[PDB]
Write an enzyme that holds these catalytic residues in place. Structure first.
Site, PDB file in Angstrom:
ATOM      1  N   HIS A  29      -8.018  45.171 -40.032  1.00 24.20           N
ATOM      2  CA  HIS A  29      -9.300  45.205 -39.223  1.00 24.20           C
ATOM      3  C   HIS A  29      -9.768  43.838 -39.181  1.00 24.20           C
ATOM      4  O   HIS A  29     -10.143  43.108 -37.951  1.00 24.20           O
ATOM      5  CB  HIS A  29     -10.386  46.140 -39.655  1.00 24.20           C
ATOM      6  CG  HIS A  29     -11.847  46.255 -39.020  1.00 24.20           C
ATOM      7  ND1 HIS A  29     -11.999  46.865 -37.786  1.00 24.20           N
ATOM      8  CD2 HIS A  29     -12.750  45.372 -39.217  1.00 24.20           C
ATOM      9  CE1 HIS A  29     -13.434  46.606 -37.400  1.00 24.20           C
ATOM     10  NE2 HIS A  29     -13.748  45.575 -38.205  1.00 24.20           N
ATOM     11  N   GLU A  30      -9.952  43.256 -40.520  1.00 26.61           N
ATOM     12  CA  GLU A  30     -10.605  41.821 -40.651  1.00 26.61           C
ATOM     13  C   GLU A  30      -9.857  40.817 -39.810  1.00 26.61           C
ATOM     14  O   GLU A  30     -10.290  39.934 -39.380  1.00 26.61           O
ATOM     15  CB  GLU A  30     -11.071  41.613 -42.051  1.00 26.61           C
ATOM     16  CG  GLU A  30     -11.940  42.745 -42.676  1.00 26.61           C
ATOM     17  CD  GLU A  30     -13.202  42.601 -42.096  1.00 26.61           C
ATOM     18  OE1 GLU A  30     -13.645  41.670 -41.642  1.00 26.61           O
ATOM     19  OE2 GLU A  30     -13.650  43.590 -42.210  1.00 26.61           O
ATOM     20  N   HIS A  51     -10.396  40.533 -36.250  1.00 26.15           N
ATOM     21  CA  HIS A  51     -11.446  39.648 -36.010  1.00 26.15           C
ATOM     22  C   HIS A  51     -11.058  37.949 -36.033  1.00 26.15           C
ATOM     23  O   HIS A  51     -11.305  37.376 -35.404  1.00 26.15           O
ATOM     24  CB  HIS A  51     -12.631  39.556 -36.945  1.00 26.15           C
ATOM     25  CG  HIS A  51     -13.606  40.903 -36.922  1.00 26.15           C
ATOM     26  ND1 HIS A  51     -13.684  41.462 -35.731  1.00 26.15           N
ATOM     27  CD2 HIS A  51     -13.757  41.766 -37.985  1.00 26.15           C
ATOM     28  CE1 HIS A  51     -14.333  42.658 -35.835  1.00 26.15           C
ATOM     29  NE2 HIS A  51     -14.362  42.515 -37.101  1.00 26.15           N
ATOM     30  N   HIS A 110     -15.545  44.261 -31.629  1.00 27.88           N
ATOM     31  CA  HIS A 110     -15.474  45.484 -31.928  1.00 27.88           C
ATOM     32  C   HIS A 110     -15.072  46.137 -30.847  1.00 27.88           C
ATOM     33  O   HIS A 110     -15.798  46.032 -29.848  1.00 27.88           O
ATOM     34  CB  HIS A 110     -16.663  46.213 -32.764  1.00 27.88           C
ATOM     35  CG  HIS A 110     -16.795  45.610 -34.201  1.00 27.88           C
ATOM     36  ND1 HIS A 110     -18.164  45.370 -34.555  1.00 27.88           N
ATOM     37  CD2 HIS A 110     -15.832  45.624 -35.204  1.00 27.88           C
ATOM     38  CE1 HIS A 110     -17.641  44.977 -35.797  1.00 27.88           C
ATOM     39  NE2 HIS A 110     -16.440  45.080 -36.329  1.00 27.88           N
TER      40      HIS A 110
HETATM   41 ZN   LIG Z   1     -15.175  44.439 -37.890  1.00 27.04          ZN
END
Ligand SMILES: [Zn+2]
Ligand SMILES: [Ca+2]
Ligand SMILES: [Ca+2]
Ligand SMILES: [Ca+2]
Ligand SMILES: [Pt+2]
Ligand SMILES: [Zn+2]
Length: 168
Positions: free
Chosen positions: A119-120, A123, A129
Site C-alpha cells: 500500500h505505502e 503512494h 487512495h
Molecule cells: Zn494510503
C-alpha cells in the site's frame, strides 16, 4: 483509482530503495522479504525495476519510527495511522515511514508488514487512495482471511499503468 494532484510520477524506470533501519518486531529477513515482495507486486505490472542500496541516498528511503521522527507528521502510538509515504520526487518524496508502535508481523496476528508496505509503495509511486474496496489502495487496513492469494486488483493495476504503462 486516484493519482496525486498534478500526477507527480517518477521520470525514470529504474528506482533505488534503502532500508534505513529495522523494527525489533521481526527478524531482519522477514523485513527484507516483505519489502521485496511489496516492490515486486508493482514491478510485475509496469516497466519499473528496483534495486537495493546499502549506503548513500536511494529514491525510496524506508524506515521505522515512532511519534516525532523527522518530518511534520508525527506518528500517533498504537493503532490508527500505521505508516505514511510521500509521492514521487526528490529528497523525502518517495520515502515510506512505518509506525513502530504497531506490532509488525509476517502473518496476520499483528499488522502485516507486506500488506502495509505494498500500500505505502503505491503512494511512493504516485497512486493516491482508491474508492474501490477490493483495491490495495483503498485506505482501510483490512486484516482479511488469507494473504496467500493476495492479488492486486484491476483497479490498482489500471491506476499504476495509467502512470507508467504495462510491462514492455
Ligand atoms: Zn494510503
Ligand atoms: Ca526520496
Ligand atoms: Ca499508529
Ligand atoms: Ca513495533
Ligand atoms: Pt535517505
Ligand atoms: Zn514520517
Amino acid at each position: 483509482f486516484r493519482t496525486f494532484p498534478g500526477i507527480p510520477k517518477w521520470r525514470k524506470t529504474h528506482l533505488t530503495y534503502r532500508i534505513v533501519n529495522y523494527t525489533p518486531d521481526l527478524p531482519k529477513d522477514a523485513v527484507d522479504s516483505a519489502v521485496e515482495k511489496a516492490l515486486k507486486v508493482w514491478e510485475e505490472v509496469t516497466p519499473l525495476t528496483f534495486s537495493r542500496l546499502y549506503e548513500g541516498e536511494a529514491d525510496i528511503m524506508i524506515s521505522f519510527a515512532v511519534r516525532e521522527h523527522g518530518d511534520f507528521y508525527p506518528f500517533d502510538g498504537p493503532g490508527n495511522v500505521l505508516a505514511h509515504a510521500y509521492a514521487p520526487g526528490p529528497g523525502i518524496n518517495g520515502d515510506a515511514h512505518f509506525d513502530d508502535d504497531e506490532q509488525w508481523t509476517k502473518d496476520t496476528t499483528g499488522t502485516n508488514l507486506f500488506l502495509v508496505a505494498a500500500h505505502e509503495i503505491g503512494h511512493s509511486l504516485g497512486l493516491f487512495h482508491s474508492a474501490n474496496t477490493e483495491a490495495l489502495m483503498y485506505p482501510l487496513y483490512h486484516s482479511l482471511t488469507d494473504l496467500t492469494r493476495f492479488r492486486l486488483s484491476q483497479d490498482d493495476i489500471n491506476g499504476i499503468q495509467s502512470l507508467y504503462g504495462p510491462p514492455p
